[PDB]
């Protein structure tokens, strides 16, 4: 993903994404459809 599809997708930065926990990091993704 480009650092604005970041922002877009999850409405934070590429880093804060990264920065979170990991089964937050999983369910924020898993609620879109994403893996």
Avoid: I, Y
């Avoid at 877009?8 to 920065?19: D, I």
């Amino acid at each position: 993903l480009s650092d604005e599809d970041f922002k877009a997708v999850f409405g934070m930065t590429r880093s804060a994404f990264a920065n979170l926990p990991l089964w937050k990091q999983q369910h924020l993704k898993k609620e879109k459809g994403l893996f």
